[PDB]
Design a binder for this molecule. Structure first.
Ligand SMILES: CCCCCCCCCCCCCCCCCC(=O)OC[C@H](COP(=O)([O-])OCC[N+](C)(C)C)OC(=O)CCCCCCCCCCCCCCCCC
Ligand SMILES: CCCCCCCCCCCCCCCCCCCC(=O)O[C@H](COC(=O)CCCCCCCCCCCCCC)COP(=O)(O)OCCN
Ligand SMILES: CCCCCCCCCCCCCCCCCCCC(=O)O[C@H](COC(=O)CCCCCCCCCCCCCC)COP(=O)(O)OCCN
Ligand SMILES: CCCCCCCCCCCCCCCCCCCC(=O)O[C@H](COC(=O)CCCCCCCCCCCCCC)COP(=O)(O)OCCN
Ligand SMILES: CCCCCCCCCCCCCCCCCCCC(=O)O[C@H](COC(=O)CCCCCCCCCCCCCC)COP(=O)(O)OCCN
Ligand SMILES: CCCCCCCCCCCCCCCCCC(=O)OC[C@@H](O)COP(=O)(O)OCC[N+](C)(C)C
Ligand SMILES: COP(=O)(O)OP(=O)(O)OCC[C@H](C)CC/C=C(/C)CC/C=C(\C)CC/C=C(\C)CCC=C(C)C
Ligand SMILES: CC(C)CCC[C@@H](C)[C@H]1CC[C@H]2[C@@H]3CC=C4C[C@@H](O)CC[C@]4(C)[C@H]3CC[C@]12C
Ligand SMILES: CC(C)CCC[C@@H](C)[C@H]1CC[C@H]2[C@@H]3CC=C4C[C@@H](O)CC[C@]4(C)[C@H]3CC[C@]12C
Ligand SMILES: CC(C)CCC[C@@H](C)[C@H]1CC[C@H]2[C@@H]3CC=C4C[C@@H](O)CC[C@]4(C)[C@H]3CC[C@]12C
Ligand SMILES: CC(C)CCC[C@@H](C)[C@H]1CC[C@H]2[C@@H]3CC=C4C[C@@H](O)CC[C@]4(C)[C@H]3CC[C@]12C
Ligand SMILES: CC(C)CCC[C@@H](C)[C@H]1CC[C@H]2[C@@H]3CC=C4C[C@@H](O)CC[C@]4(C)[C@H]3CC[C@]12C
Ligand SMILES: *[C@@H]1O[C@H](CO)[C@@H](O)[C@H](O)[C@H]1NC(C)=O
Lengths: 86, 80, 150, 214, 422, 150, 150
């Protein structure tokens, strides 16, 4: 699937940005950072007993971030293969 | 979480003073000695002023942060 | 027990539904009319084919009328203020959407009927634009119905 | 395989540095402490006869919490431990882990690629750089971890917890202790930290001799 | 005018030359601009993440500079950006620094040292209970009770303000004071450079009338304001919050001589007398500039040796004095542009985050990990389209404007010719 | 407590959302149409490629219809004055943002379709500008939703 | 306790913040667009360079949107008259500031696109003016952020 080198360069730079920033976001969520509390998809019931439920939700969002990072890793690999093609 | 205002002030003051005062004398002689020394001194002055303003604005607060009850509940458990 | 003035807004809706749309239609049937006449002097054979914008404008009026009749049938002596406001809003939506659609149809139809005398290939293009204008009135009607039958 | 290099004095030093700071990692990063207390209020039926809590190695104690008795109406109050010392414990454990990884790499190089290591004495040069860096790291981290262990003993002390407990400030309430954590593991960790400190201090001179600067 | 420009300093020399080539052998603003333009840009573009992106882009341009220099194209915008590759590199570095100071990274703080704000002392020493948390939607925090506020954050703004709904309340004051402080200090540095100009050109008349009145006026009126800002920061605390005066009202009263017996008390003992003295010196600095120099020029060039036209000289000096006196005020006001642009950048980044990637992060199901893919791309492109390119361009041009007008008006003339060799 | 007249504003929301947007779209469909009719006399081949401005005006009308129906499907009898005010605000935002976007699309699309007859390379340019106009309406829609679905 | 109409004003503020800003942006996106269409016949290569005014106009709209959202997310049922009128003031500030800034950007860009067509050296000059105009809208936004969070 040959394409213009400019698009491949944009794809690889976006892939690097996504991988780095989403890996950092996943690490920060998994650390249960309070700064990102607003992004955690919790509900009222989660404030019943203790913070363990919110910790689990933090971990779930971190897993989502890592999945996004992996998808962007695949995208960057595709872009690098296209660059090697060109 | 007692952030004493002695280690930060001493450390940053001495660091930026060494960069802005001691730094110029260590710049190797050459065509760019003057511009490099100006860069050193100006960076020291600007960065130290910015950090000093930032730290002093927080010293002696006249009111505390307004935190939602959800984030207050979380912060009680999490933060020190 | 409902306010005696509640029906007022209702009738306004109906009246508006048939006035503004009519006004819009008039503009259409006016502007296109002129264009058609200006075209007929040179290319008479395009008269019938060029009556399309007028028809479009006419359809806009129909929308208005339809909604008006709807409202004009949903009026009752004890019509609640909520339903009266709903009918007024439906009338406003249909009437003013038909007004804007009629203005657009008039302008586009005049321009396209004048052009089709010079470039026949423009005919189809004009038609598309007219539809894109006509649908505007349709949208109003849709919303009107949603408000009127709510 | 230049296994004889392992048997050399510097090989022995590197092996010891490998096994130690693995002992420290196992003793510190694997620690799990437990505290048990009891309270007999003015009304015996409201007594918290058995309260249990558990904490882990990172010593983020301020997160650790438990529902102590209120001694009034049978209610409970949430109480959190005082302060954390992860700044010291994590620092020490990371230092030990880095020492273990570097020692494993150095042992592999000595066994397989000691010729390249000794080439131009540059391998010894980076060895001396790392030796000085690790000596400074151990010097700071051993003291940091010792102070952290002392403050841990103070804070986790059920006596201090009860001292800060507002229950004793009421009438009739008596708060007493039931268990104490195992302090052998952390003392062993600090002892092994000092052992690693002295090991790297000795390695300084050996690397100096190898690099030819002696 | 010949400046012996270098590869690194070419961007800044062209930047300062755009408003007019400096006269023959006058204090060049290029060496000071090399730092104060990236810094005044970072004060507005303060963001760790956007600073990182800008630094990486500028480093890419620098490393591959030879390739693009060889491979020339006609793209005006790309050529302009490339010519300022060093300017952009310095701007990115200083923006990284200021974003660290602002504790901002894509609109999110860091908390690498630990916040000074503990909520537990509210429950322990304060009256709070879980009932109060349940009953109050937003509540607040107070440092008056002992353990809530454990000193200032060692480096940069405390992270808790990111999650505090009182964020803007504090940040507006902090950034307004920062902008005014930096502006006044920059203008004072400009006036000192004007003194250097006068000394080199051997114009003692300007030194004694001109520079000295200018510096006295500026320092007494506006340097005193910086002193008041710093003193209020050091002095008033949470316990004395109730009677903490407003420096805006105090400055206005100083100008109006409206020291009242009611309202906020004095910042310090003897404020009335000292402020009256400062105001008197400030007004006297106006006649000092206006009347004196024309009279001495007339005396020494029309009474001695005997075209000089006294009326036009007096008019010109009056225009210069009016310009400078209104300029001090209008420039101290204009330097609030730093706070305005910084707050705008911060709020645009915040809203972009919470409207784009809050959608992808606020999803319970693991399938959201796929959504975060597409969402993120949009975020990324937005952060490169609105923030990095457009807000960055605005901040760049406004730092430029601050340098051309507010700073260089104090010492720069710019009435020379560029040295165009053969 | 929930006055009898609380629904009125909500109704005036829906109508607005449908009316003003339509007006904007009509303008976008009208002005652009004239331009196409002017351009197509000399460059017939570009007539179909040049209908994009009309499509964008229709999309503005679709934004209006979306918000109008989303409001009309939330008008309960006892709608609180707060919710009715929210619906009125959403309708006004979407409708008037769509009206401004329709003006922008009309001017830009007409100028671009007439210029593209001269310089084809302007086409892409025009499209970009049209997008920058279209997003304006989109912005309104966004806010409208944020208000209506609150 | 609070009047049942207290939420009206704030809502209008939000809508105003979206509407007027959009209008401003629209005018810009129109005027600059016209200018580009006039320029691009002789100097096609400058279309991309000369699209900057439109972008700035778009930025103005964004500011309004921001404030609108910032107000549309803060409207509570028991919104007091104090908060309601604070949000109204913020909305008026941002909306009218964006309107004026959009007018200035449109006029200056329409002049400067043609000027840069004639004299290339004016390009940067045009930009040096546009940003000024743009920040006028920004100033409004700033005051809005001061008000709606007072
Ligand atoms: C991934 C993205 C990361 C972010 C990167 C972008 C950051 C956003 C801000 C960039 C602004 C760039 C402008 C400054 C650089 C030019 C200054 C310089 O050194 O050149 C002297 C320039 C051009 O160089 P010159 O040709 O005069 O060089 C001197 C040559 N002799 C001596 C022969 C005459 O000279 C001037 O005219 C001085 C005044 C410049 C004032 C700048 C006006 C604004 C320009 C806007 C640029 C385009 C917008 C960005 C578009 C991006 C999309 C492609
Ligand atoms: C309250 C906060 C603000 C405070 C700001 C004012 C205080 C800082 C500046 C005070 C003055 C510093 C010293 C002035 C220069 C003295 C000359 C000797 C300097 C030196 O050792 O380097 C020479 C080169 O210097 C040179 O080539 C020139 C060096 C110039 C240094 C000063 C420039 C930075 C000022 C801007 C500050 C930042 C902005 C503030 C908002 C070497 O001698 P040589 O052999 O090179 O011979 C000279 C020419 N070649
Ligand atoms: C992230 C937190 C920190 C942010 C704040 C600090 C930011 C500092 C930014 C300056 C650093 C980058 C300098 C440019 C690097 C590229 C070099 C370009 C070429 C070069 O060597 O330039 C020379 C000019 O001096 C120079 O290039 C200057 C180099 C020495 C500068 C010393 C001052 C640095 C700042 C203070 C110390 C560090 C503080 C932070 C810890 C002369 O060009 P040439 O002769 O090579 O040209 C060859 C053709 N003629
Ligand atoms: C359901 C639908 C809604 C129901 C509610 C609506 C009820 C009906 C009332 C609205 C008006 C209906 C009548 C239509 C008016 C036709 C307008 C024609 C405009 C026109 O061409 O006249 C221009 C003058 O404008 C004018 O003179 C403007 C028109 C005159 C004003 C009409 C109002 C009269 C005042 C009312 C008094 C009572 C108020 C209550 C106390 C002249 O054009 P040019 O300037 O180029 O001339 C140059 C050549 N001569
Ligand atoms: C090129 C650079 C150009 C210059 C740029 C800088 C701007 C210069 C501005 C004018 C000159 C300096 C400022 C003079 C105005 C008074 C400053 C007062 C500062 C202040 O708040 O201090 C408090 C008053 O001090 C006292 O209680 C002591 C008595 C009152 C103050 C006496 C005068 C001190 C300043 C001496 C001149 C310095 C000249 C600097 C250029 C501390 O007092 P507290 O809080 O402990 O007491 C309070 C309960 N009683
Ligand atoms: C294209 C080029 C590449 C671009 C690169 C961009 C990189 C951007 C990545 C980051 C973006 C997201 C920012 C979010 C930052 C918040 C994370 C945070 O707060 O961190 C710290 C938390 O982990 C801990 O904090 P805590 O648990 O609350 O407190 C405990 C803290 N003690 C232990 C120090 C007391
Ligand atoms: O912190 P807070 O924001 O809560 O309030 P504060 O009082 O504690 O701190 C404020 C600190 C500083 C005073 C904040 C700086 C803010 C400024 C808004 C205005 C700066 C403009 C100046 C100095 C020149 C223009 C004139 C302004 C009033 C008119 C004066 C001139 C005449 C009357 C002729
Ligand atoms: C088709 C042209 C002539 C335009 C006129 C449309 C007329 C004939 C039709 C088309 C759509 C129809 C409406 C479709 C839906 C509704 C809602 C339903 O609950 C009852 C009837 C009602 C209100 C219909 C009435 C008649 C109607 C308005
Ligand atoms: C040109 C013509 C064919 C267009 C369509 C006819 C329109 C104008 C009229 C004629 C008869 C009308 C219907 C007659 C009776 C009723 C029942 C009433 O409870 C609701 C309205 C409703 C359903 C009317 C809707 C509008 C209607 C369909
Ligand atoms: C191509 C067709 C479907 C659209 C053109 C005719 C329009 C006017 C007609 C066709 C079907 C109609 C809908 C059919 C049913 C209902 C449900 C009723 O509770 C509200 C009105 C509503 C929502 C009608 C609105 C008007 C409507 C959309
Ligand atoms: C059918 C295709 C061609 C669509 C053409 C016209 C569109 C605008 C019409 C046709 C049918 C309509 C829908 C029919 C029924 C309902 C449910 C009713 O409670 C209100 C809105 C809603 C959801 C209508 C929205 C508008 C609608 C989708
Ligand atoms: C003729 C065609 C092009 C008209 C536009 C497409 C129609 C079919 C679609 C596109 C998006 C749709 C809307 C999307 C979401 C909702 C919200 C829901 O609570 C009521 C229906 C409503 C408001 C839909 C009505 C029908 C709608 C407007
Ligand atoms: C109650 O509240 C006041 C005001 O915050 C506080 O100062 C005081 O210490 C509290 N008293 C208690 C909890 O007894």
């Amino acid at each position: 699937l040959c394409c213009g080198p400019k698009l491949a360069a944009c794809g690889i730079v976006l892939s690097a940005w996504g991988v780095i920033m989403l890996i950092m976001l996943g690490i920060f969520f998994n650390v249960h950072s309070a700064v990102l509390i607003e992004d955690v998809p919790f509900t009222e019931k989660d404030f019943e007993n203790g913070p363990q439920n919110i910790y689990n939700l933090y971990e779930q969002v971190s897993y989502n971030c890592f999945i996004a990072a992996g998808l962007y890793l695949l995208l960057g690999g595709f872009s690098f293969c296209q660059v090697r093609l060109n | 979480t007692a952030h004493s205002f002695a280690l930060p002030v001493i450390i940053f003051t001495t660091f930026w003073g060494l960069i802005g005062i001691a730094g110029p004398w260590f710049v190797p002689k050459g065509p760019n000695r003057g511009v490099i020394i100006t860069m050193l001194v100006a960076t020291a002055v600007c960065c130290y002023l910015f950090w000093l303003i930032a730290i002093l604005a927080q010293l002696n607060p006249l009111f505390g942060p307004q935190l939602k009850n959800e984030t207050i509940w979380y912060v009680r458990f999490l933060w020190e | 027990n409902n306010p005696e003035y509640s029906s007022f807004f209702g009738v306004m809706g109906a009246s508006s539904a048939m006035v503004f749309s009519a006004m819009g239609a008039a503009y259409g049937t006016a502007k296109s009319g002129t264009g058609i006449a200006a075209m007929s002097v040179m290319r008479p054979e395009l008269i019938m084919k060029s009556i399309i914008p007028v028809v479009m404008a006419g359809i806009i009026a129909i929308y208005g009328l339809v909604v008006a009749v709807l409202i004009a049938n949903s009026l009752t002596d004890g019509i609640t203020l909520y339903r009266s406001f709903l009918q007024l809003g439906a009338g406003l939506s249909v009437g003013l959407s038909g007004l804007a659609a009629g203005f657009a149809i008039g302008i586009v139809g005049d321009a396209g009927v004048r052009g089709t005398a010079q470039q026949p290939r423009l005919f189809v293009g004009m038609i598309l634009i007219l539809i894109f204008a006509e649908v505007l009135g349709l949208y109003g009607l849709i919303v009107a119905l949603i408000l009127s039958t709510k | 395989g230049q296994f004889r290099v392992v048997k050399e004095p510097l090989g022995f030093v590197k092996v010891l540095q490998w096994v130690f700071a693995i002992f420290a990692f196992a003793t510190c990063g694997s620690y799990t402490g437990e505290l048990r207390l009891s309270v007999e209020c003015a009304n015996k039926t409201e007594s918290a006869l058995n309260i249990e809590v558990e904490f882990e190695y990172p010593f983020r104690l301020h997160q650790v919490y438990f529902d102590a008795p209120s001694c009034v109406k049978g209610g409970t109050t949430k109480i959190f431990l005082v302060g954390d010392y992860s700044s010291s414990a994590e620092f020490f454990v990371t230092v030990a882990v880095f020492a273990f990884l570097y020692s494993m790499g150095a042992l592999a190089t000595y066994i397989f690629l000691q010729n390249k290591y000794r080439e131009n004495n540059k391998g010894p040069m980076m060895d001396f750089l790392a030796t000085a860096v690790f000596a400074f790291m151990w010097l700071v981290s051993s003291s940091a971890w010792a102070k952290g262990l002392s403050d841990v003993k103070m804070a986790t002390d059920p006596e201090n917890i009860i001292k800060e407990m507002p229950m004793c400030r009421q009438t009739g309430n008596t708060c007493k202790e039931l268990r104490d954590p195992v302090t052998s593991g952390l003392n062993t960790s600090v002892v092994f930290g000092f052992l690693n400190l002295v090991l790297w201090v000795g390695n300084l001179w050996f690397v100096f001799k190898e690099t030819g600067w002696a | 005018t010949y400046n012996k420009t270098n590869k690194f300093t070419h961007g800044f020399q062209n930047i300062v030359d755009a408003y007019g080539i400096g006269t023959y052998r006058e204090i060049n603003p290029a060496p000071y601009t090399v730092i104060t333009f990236p810094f005044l840009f970072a004060v507005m573009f303060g963001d760790f993440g956007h600073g990182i992106l800008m630094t990486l882009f500028a480093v890419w341009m620098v490393l591959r500079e030879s390739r693009i220099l060889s491979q020339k194209n006609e793209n005006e915008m790309f050529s302009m950006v490339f010519s300022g590759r060093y300017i952009i590199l310095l701007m990115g570095l200083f923006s990284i620094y200021t974003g660290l100071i602002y504790n901002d990274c894509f609109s999110k703080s860091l908390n690498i040292f630990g916040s000074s704000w503990s909520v537990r002392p509210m429950f322990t020493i304060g009256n709070w209970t879980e009932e109060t948390l349940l009953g109050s939607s937003v509540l607040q925090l107070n440092p008056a009770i002992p353990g809530v506020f454990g000193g200032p954050y060692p480096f940069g703004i405390d992270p808790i303000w990111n999650i505090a709904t009182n964020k803007l309340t504090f940040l507006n004051s902090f950034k307004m004071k920062m902008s005014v402080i930096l502006g006044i200090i920059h203008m004072l540095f400009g006036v000192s450079l004007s003194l250097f100009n006068h000394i080199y050109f051997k114009k003692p008349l300007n030194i004694y009338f001109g520079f000295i009145p200018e510096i006295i006026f500026m320092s007494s009126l506006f340097g005193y304001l910086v002193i008041l800002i710093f003193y209020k920061w050091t002095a008033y605390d949470a316990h004395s919050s109730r009677n903490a005066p407003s420096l805006l009202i105090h400055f206005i009263n100083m100008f109006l001589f409206s020291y009242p017996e009611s309202g906020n008390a004095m910042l310090y003992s003897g404020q009335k007398g000292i402020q009256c003295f400062l105001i008197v010196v400030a007004m006297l600095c106006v006649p000092w500039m206006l009347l004196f120099k024309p009279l001495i020029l007339r005396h020494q060039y029309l009474r001695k040796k005997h075209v000089f036209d006294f009326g036009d000289t007096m008019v010109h000096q009056a225009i210069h004095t009016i310009e400078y006196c209104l300029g001090c005020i209008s420039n101290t006001a204009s330097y609030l542009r730093l706070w305005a642009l910084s707050l705008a950048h911060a709020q645009l980044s915040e809203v972009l985050w919470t409207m784009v990637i809050h959608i992808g992060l606020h999803v319970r199901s693991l399938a959201g990990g796929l959504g975060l893919f597409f969402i993120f791309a949009a975020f990324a492109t937005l952060t490169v389209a609105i923030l990095l390119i457009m807000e960055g361009l605005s901040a760049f041009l406004h730092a430029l404007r601050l340098h051309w007008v507010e700073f260089q008006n104090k010492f720069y003339t710019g009435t020379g010719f560029k040295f165009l060799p053969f």
